[PDB]
Design a protein around this ligand. Sequence first.
Ligand SMILES: [Ca+2]
Ligand SMILES: [Cl-]
Ligand SMILES: [Cl-]
Ligand SMILES: [Cl-]
Ligand SMILES: [Cl-]
Ligand SMILES: [Cl-]
Lengths: 152, 154, 154, 150
Amino acid sequence: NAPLLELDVQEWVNHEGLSNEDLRGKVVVVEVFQMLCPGCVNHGVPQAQKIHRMIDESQVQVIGLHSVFEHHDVMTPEALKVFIDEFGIKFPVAVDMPREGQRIPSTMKKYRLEGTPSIILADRKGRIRQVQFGQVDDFVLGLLLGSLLSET
Amino acid sequence: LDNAPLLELDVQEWVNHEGLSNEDLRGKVVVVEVFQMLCPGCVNHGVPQAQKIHRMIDESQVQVIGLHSVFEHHDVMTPEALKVFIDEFGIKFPVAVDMPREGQRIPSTMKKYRLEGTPSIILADRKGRIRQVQFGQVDDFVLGLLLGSLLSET
Amino acid sequence: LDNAPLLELDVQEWVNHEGLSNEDLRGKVVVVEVFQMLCPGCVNHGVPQAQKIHRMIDESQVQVIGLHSVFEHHDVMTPEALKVFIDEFGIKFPVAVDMPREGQRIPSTMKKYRLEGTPSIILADRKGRIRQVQFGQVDDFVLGLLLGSLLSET
Amino acid sequence: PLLELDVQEWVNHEGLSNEDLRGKVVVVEVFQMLCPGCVNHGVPQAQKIHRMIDESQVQVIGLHSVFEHHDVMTPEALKVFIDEFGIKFPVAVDMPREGQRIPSTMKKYRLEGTPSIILADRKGRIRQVQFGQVDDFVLGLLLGSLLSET
Ligand SMILES: [Ca+2]
Ligand SMILES: [Cl-]
Ligand SMILES: [Cl-]
Ligand SMILES: [Cl-]
Ligand SMILES: [Cl-]
Ligand SMILES: [Cl-]
């Protein structure tokens, strides 16, 4: 049933890139955001920061994926890099592979996200278990992560 | 985990519910919320968190239990006052009164599990083994991670 | 404003402070927080909002007064229980107990101003006259606007 | 000091004359589009005032004052940010000073940084300048006081 997680990334902006084999054996949280989205800035990113800070990469890896689908000329990777420091993000952030002639970048298209913020949760076996659009409750998110972490 | 104690509560009375039994509990993750009715951290944070859990997760999976352990101002935090507290705050989950001990401020369950104070949380697994005890404010995210983890264990 | 009634608390006792007269209050904006110790709206929102005002604004400008108007469950919400509530929650503003009326659940100040329940706020101006009465949750910004406005009136 | 702003352009609204200003309390929210404090707290709070209080009483003004990272924080970007965050109060772009990092309005009022709030009375006179996060209640008291003053 469930598809494997395969990110299509133009570049990793603050970290060494991650292979799939790197992420296998860990639960993965991909936070998909645009830098200029209030839902992403006020809620989703800070929620990801919290996770990264609390749990170690042995167990869970947080990946930021900047998937810009509108206003491309102002949301450049240069802009992103500033946004990242300015907001103090320390987890790995990747720019979604853009597509020629297309507003929607590749990962976002492939997994058919409704928009940003979205989160993608993958299991230790590298396979996608949840995709959620919008604001996610801290409690609900904890239950979801915990569930993934402990199942055999 | 070989020595994690089994959850056993020593209780004077169940205030708003028929009492649960240990059998009733097994196969469910148990959250025990240990509170005093006039403790600000409990009223502001801990009880509303337990209420949220009770609303969100079905009783077939998680059972929330309130435990009123009065360790100060006993004459004020009576079982009658607690019934009123429960009505005023709309607490729907089952609430027990910690068995008082003659001559002592600290009640029986609080003593037994060595609690620092209120609020405290006790989490037990489907087998009844106490897996976490925590004093004070607990983040919603952390709480979810702990429960989700307990819920999915083989 | 000619029509506005003066603030007149009917008080059985002042629990934590020497009593205040209207004369002591004159020249100050008065905030009266009408509460029950066991009401969620009060415990969660109104009382803490009153503490914030008390901490933030000097008594040379604004006086905060607590009025405990118990209209239900009186046996549980006695003045002794109130004293404990005050200590536990760290309330440092003066608290008065609304004078009870014999044979009736609703106390005197509450009846007189026809409060809907708790929490309520009563604001009076620098000449001691009641300018607002509000039931329920009041947003912090709106309350600031209301106070700020009274403070600067001629 | 009578409030006077040095504006290169108004992005989302026609220009504000003194004639528009007169008789009103004015709130100037001085911000950067990528400054967290502005984004998290200050801009939303400004939006709240604007939503809460009619324009006939209080006029909320956003002033974009880019002192760093300039090419990022362009008037083209700002329009996008306003659109994304749904800002409906008039927002003006600081006039820049040639060869200078900090702009004209920020300069003249000796503002510490972003975010900053500038409060002016009904007669247009500047009554308060404050930097950093401000409590909703405090902001209420200050505006409330200005509104009622005679
Ligand atoms: Ca027992
Ligand atoms: Cl981070
Ligand atoms: Cl409940
Ligand atoms: Cl206080
Ligand atoms: Cl707005
Ligand atoms: Cl400039």
